[PDB]
Amino acid sequence: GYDRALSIFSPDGHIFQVEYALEAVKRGTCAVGVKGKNCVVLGCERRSTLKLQDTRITPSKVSKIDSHVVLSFSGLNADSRILIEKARVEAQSHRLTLEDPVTVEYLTRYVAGVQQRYTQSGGVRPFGVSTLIAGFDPRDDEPKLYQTEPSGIYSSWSAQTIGRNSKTVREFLEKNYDRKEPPATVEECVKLTVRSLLEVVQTGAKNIEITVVKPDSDIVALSSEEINQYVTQIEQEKQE
Amino acid sequence: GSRRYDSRTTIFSPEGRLYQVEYALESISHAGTAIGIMASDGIVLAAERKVTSTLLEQDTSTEKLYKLNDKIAVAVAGLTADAEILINTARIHAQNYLKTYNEDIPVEILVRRLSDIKQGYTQHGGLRPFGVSFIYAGYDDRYGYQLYTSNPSGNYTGWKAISVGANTSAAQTLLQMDYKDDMKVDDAIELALKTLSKTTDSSALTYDRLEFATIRKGANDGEVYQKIFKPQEIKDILVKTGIT
Amino acid sequence: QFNPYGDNGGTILGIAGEDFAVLAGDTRNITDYSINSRYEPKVFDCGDNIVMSANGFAADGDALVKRFKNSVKWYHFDHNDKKLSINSAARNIQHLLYSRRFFPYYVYNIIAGLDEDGKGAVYSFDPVGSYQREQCRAGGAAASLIMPFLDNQVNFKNQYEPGTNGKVKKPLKYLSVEEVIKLVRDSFTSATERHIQVGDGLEILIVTKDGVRKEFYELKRD
Amino acid sequence: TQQPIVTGTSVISMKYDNGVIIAADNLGSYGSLLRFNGVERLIPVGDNTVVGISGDISDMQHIERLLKDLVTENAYDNPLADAEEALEPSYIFEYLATVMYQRRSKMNPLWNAIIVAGVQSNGDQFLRYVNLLGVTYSSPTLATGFGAHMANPLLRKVVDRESDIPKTTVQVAEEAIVNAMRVLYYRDARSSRNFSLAIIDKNTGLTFKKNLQVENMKWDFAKDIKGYGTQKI
Amino acid sequence: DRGVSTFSPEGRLFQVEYSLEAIKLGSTAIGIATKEGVVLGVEKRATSPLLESDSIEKIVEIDRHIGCAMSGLTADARSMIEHARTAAVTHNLYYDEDINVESLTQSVCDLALRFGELMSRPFGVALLIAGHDADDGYQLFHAEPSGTFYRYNAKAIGSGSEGAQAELLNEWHSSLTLKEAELLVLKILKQVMEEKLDENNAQLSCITKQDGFKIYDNEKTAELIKELKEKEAAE
Amino acid sequence: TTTLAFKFQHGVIVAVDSRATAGSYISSLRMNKVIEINPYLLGTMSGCAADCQYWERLLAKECRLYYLRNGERISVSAASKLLSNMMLQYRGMGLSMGSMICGWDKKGPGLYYVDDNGTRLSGQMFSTGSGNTYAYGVLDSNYKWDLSVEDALYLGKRSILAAAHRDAYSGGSVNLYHVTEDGWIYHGNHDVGELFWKVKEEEGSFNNVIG
Amino acid sequence: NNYDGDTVTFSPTGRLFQVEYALEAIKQGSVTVGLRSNTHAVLVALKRNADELSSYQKKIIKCDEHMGLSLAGLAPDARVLSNYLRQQCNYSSLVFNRKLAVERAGHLLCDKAQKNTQSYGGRPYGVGLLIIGYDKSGAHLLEFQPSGNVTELYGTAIGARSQGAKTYLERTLDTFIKIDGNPDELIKAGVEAISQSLRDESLTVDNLSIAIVGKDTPFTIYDGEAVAKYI
Amino acid sequence: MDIILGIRVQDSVILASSKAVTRGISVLKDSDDKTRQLSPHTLMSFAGEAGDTVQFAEYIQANIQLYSIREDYELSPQAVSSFVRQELAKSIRSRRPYQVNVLIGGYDKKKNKPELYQIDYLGTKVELPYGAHGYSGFYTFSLLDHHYRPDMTTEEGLDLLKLCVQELEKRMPMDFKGVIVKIVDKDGIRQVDDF
């Protein structure tokens, strides 16, 4: 079998293949995650270079791993499918062996472990993908939001963004998001998520996707018109 | 040892691109243009054969349009030999699904499977990727008529109208201009041929330089029919639309 | 058809004292109605103040003891010459036995020594690996002859105090090493009389804080 | 799992003051057929060890080759192969015992009963038994098959325990062995008159005697025996 | 290119030496061993204020009597911790006892050089393994990706290591109490850290014979930080 | 053997005998048929002694690793399932094990029966071993949810006594346990010989027996 | 230069540079001395520390009751090779009821090291070993190099500044060989030999490591206050 | 385990399954639920060798749930039944086959029709208006042959089911401790708590 060590250390102590995988994430469309008091919202950019697209059947950016956990990403689209499939299999495997659905922290730790494994296994390259994993643990009303990256490190975030121009939207979130008082309602949480994407997106038409996840496996995706109403209200307040 | 001669096909560039995937796409850009157009009452697949000869046996020839099952077909752009490897895998996958669930395979599931195979060659194994881009035209009872494309990266996307191969930039602009959502198959047939006629590198578009196919609910009652056009039938539709 | 098992007879006895322990066993080795050897040692010093005897099918018994002695050696290598405690040896032996759950070591194993508090300890095993710490245990051919005698004379079972008539039990006073050896010798002398596979010789290994000592006694050779 | 085909019967042995004696007949039986009459079942290993084998002859020939190869392998990169690092009886026995027990544990045994007789470097007598089950034991007298039932009782009258070994000379021990071989010829239906005997002494070394015969046999009393009860003529 | 298990002309494995450079870029971790216990402390180093700092888990329990702190490519430590926990509990299964700290450390270090063309590269993380057993008492070990492990009275790893190690050189003595060690870790962490040390961006932990391995609460550490400030202002 | 376990208002009672047999020979008078997996988890043993000890001690390893990974105690449901999945690996290979996994977790007190076939059942009351029928008779007629800790301990003790008396392959002594939310509590070793005569006199039961 | 990328490549002059680079790792290692008489064999090792807070890296490893070695270079490689020796010593005992000859132990190490010098992908061992032992042909001392070369010697030394101790033993050859039935005097000669390789630092209580094996003496290691006698 | 029944009426599928679990000569449980929800509108009851039944059912459940998540779509009862049949047909020639018989009751939301599939351990699939496994059919099929209509209501289906259980309780030597009854219709799966 092909055993070639592709991910290796350089004289300065860097693993270039893992670092170049982060550059693939930088190229990917922007993804944002914001957790409110009783919910988490996942926002995603859709680049408008591709029109004549069939939005019914085109792979959505946010993916359900289980009925209570979702996963969005930035980076190589094909790579993300492999992580999502593995995550979905592990979620059912956990229910089957332990008789409880996975916690969001556990699912994140598994996906992060897969990414790490691909940084020190022979004949494979790292995943060019960073993920945002969000949801609610079974019988728990505390929101969960985690991030992973090609190296395999993961951590919990009050709010976070990844992908192209993520530096800008992170700048926005750092000054706008208050820890002492997070978005109390769904509206406030979605509004803040849309506002953050409007710093980068371009047009607020079909370029913004929003997915709201609430406790007890209550997950819904907002439509174009529903999002467009947020876009309208934000700019009308801005004209002042 | 052997390491000396390894090209390392599955690595990132400093910019975060996959070298071999990008170079495979460069190969595909020189291949004959293939177009897919989805209408409300069917799908059209049109494709241009590359600089043919008069001594080529056209009626028994197939380099662009292939049948995966009774409901799904593909247009090819790139290395034909590479495409046939994948096509036969897709045909088997469709039959496996039918044997397991006793239902025809949904279009997307077949597309995802093939795209996952392409993905694998970019991440592990140390082998060159498949130099192939597909346009998938198919029907199922969930989403109805569907157009997809996949490329050597293993990434796939859904489309109302799309082109692959040579002159896709020019072709996509022409399709974006004249395409409408309430369009019908007969109109889509005309759009596909008109787009090829303007984007072609050849002097004139003729029947012997084309492969054509439609997927219609224009079959007797609630069912779907695949029509791979014969040379004489391509000649007739070229006269009908007013190109020759 | 090939039968991979056999019966080499023999009988063993382990008794735990207050600050000592004994592991005794006869030295006769047999097949069917023949004597192979009148003196074939069956109880072994395995190091770290632990004695061991695997009674039953001698080939499996020798293999197990050999493997445990090896396990003690590698325990020193891997854990900085740390002394293998009797409880740790017992648990290790369980895993040696259960590694052959589906093709068992056909032996009844007993080990003896001192626990980490300096008190006498005996552990006893079945062929598949169930074990437990005991005060008194006879194993092998004449085990059923000896155990009841030990229940009576070591744990004072069914013995009460005269005058009370069954109301007050005989108190469980501790036994000295000299008293235990008397019970061991009488157990084997009695077993030799009524069991054909028992006889020839008796070898006893006594374990104290000072080390491992041996005592040998002749038995009837018929 | 197999069945033994061509077989060799008893191997008998005993310790004496300065060494050990071992003996075995030269017959290779094929069931009740006394098929092969020139079979050597005592196999010397160096000048300090004799391995006596009973049971399946095809497996004996295999063991014979393992021992021959063992000597070859021990000499490799060994300047002291004919001195301090020569093969000892205890090394040879433990090797065989390891092989026998492994083979029984794979349910494919070498269908034999083996006695390894020899003298160690320090002059100590070595005598140990091993068989198809991997069962091992040592005793002042050892015998396989019928020998265990008939020879041991006679040999144990000479050396009944360990303390009798220094009191037993080579002449007495050889006499006992030769008498035992006669008794086996009288009473073992799978035995022969012709046999081999080996003595390994710590002073005089290895003496290997071939083409020995059972002699001084009593048959004359047979003439007087008539019928099975009431018959007089 | 070149082999992964290649020796340099100086007699060192290139990859092992390069992994050590990655460890120098990692966040600071400090360990101090005393006769009353071993203290482990780490710099969390959050990349952003929105990152919930309590999810940064750079101090980890291996067994009740063994703890562990990490520095470098911390993702690489997860499989090492998993192996350590398995080794610790497996030995308890086989021998009905706690495993020696040295033996646990040796088991972790046996993974180190299992790389070639097994895993494709050495680990890019160093570990401070602290614990207690009956034979050798309170112990602190430094496990490297070279497969080598040294025992230490006190040790610092990470970006501010050589500066911290020089400070530990002067401060450590054989009669240190547990409380004194706690303040000493906090003092040196505060010295080498970029950002100002508080209960949210730094974490303490310890291992004692009685209570075993414990990670300190942010409320408990906050008091020790306040106690440190006052005693430094006292002279 | 005889083992039992039942849930009630104040947790779960666990009672077992201590006899071990090799044919008709009583090999052991006092064998521990309960395993202390952790301060809040217990496991009973019936069937092959070696199988019970090995696999339930291996379960404790796996339950312990759960705590280290998740920083939290494993549920009774999950622990019982790990064990049943172990049994399912050696499917038809000849293992003989019957155990009840007893404990307290976030759902409250938990009780699961698990055997060598892989069967895994949740329930209020279980009894395993050669004498389970005798124990069930006493349990079924005297069980309530509203039992006091003192009365519940006695019920499980008395139910084992019933089996120890009638079943030839049950006896020796009774080992009692009580599981609370603060953990399990050992309630001693009780010799059946002494316990029988005591219960006979105090209760008035076993009238047919002379003493 | 162009021929040092891997172990599978000879240079134009017939040299194996990866093996030579592995040999270099031994020279960087701390000094260790080996010597023997007709009755006993002794190892003396200068242990090295990382700093004042650190412990002193152990240099001597026991392989059997009658055999053991001292290391110089990559310590993990010594652990692998000593583990192999432990197994081989143990195979000889379990199968042949025979203590492994020291000479045969050297032949086995040679062959194990050699395989790593001829195959692609792997690497040579980066450690040197001094093996002592007492077998049926008396006391023995071996020197192992990761090139594969194993040599039987009266005395030797390997590691940094080992040339000084090696010269001393070459002068003392006739004296220390005759030290029969006197373990303390043989150790003294070893301690005096390793002292010729010291600069700046001297032999302290937690610095020095000694091991001995002989006629009626199992392989035992002396560390800590057990070697204060010889300082 | 023993008795599992199934009946397909006008607008729903009803499954009845015994509550008893026996081990040796003792009934360990009299409230056991011999069923698993494979999807919101598909229920599978099971009966066979001890241990194998639950392991197989949960394995099928996991696979269908995995499919549901992957495609964000519920498989038709027909598709699920075919998947289950293949797994059993695969199993029967294995080293150690899974000895499990199942009934799959589902409501097809596309066709707006209830569907009942009977599959035995060999992988023998049949679509039926009513079905059973083991000896259950011997007692009950004569009643079902007589009384069954395809236009029956759910309430009439339950009444005919009661009559079947009464006949079983009268003529079987086996005490199966009553049945748990579950209904599968357009609104999903629910349990009849009083039967």
Ligand SMILES: *[C@@]([C])([C][O])[C@](*)(=O)[C]([C]C1=[C][C]=[C][C]=[C]1)[N]C(=O)[C]([C]C1=[C][N]C2=C1[C]=[C][C]=[C]2)[N]C(=O)[C]([C])[N]C(=O)C1=C([C])C2=C([C]1)[C]=[C][C]=[C]2
């Ligand atoms: C009843 C006593 C059964 O009669 C009960 O189920 C006990 C359970 C038990 C659990 C843990 C520990 C001890 C007992 N079972 C046994 O005692 C079993 C029953 C049994 C015998 N053969 C058999 C059984 C079960 C299934 C298949 C086959 N008895 C044993 O396992 C026998 C083999 N063990 C012993 O006799 C000895 C043990 C254990 C032991 C001995 C003998 C000696 C020293 C230590 C331990």
Ligand SMILES: [Mg+2]
């Ligand atoms: Mg007798």
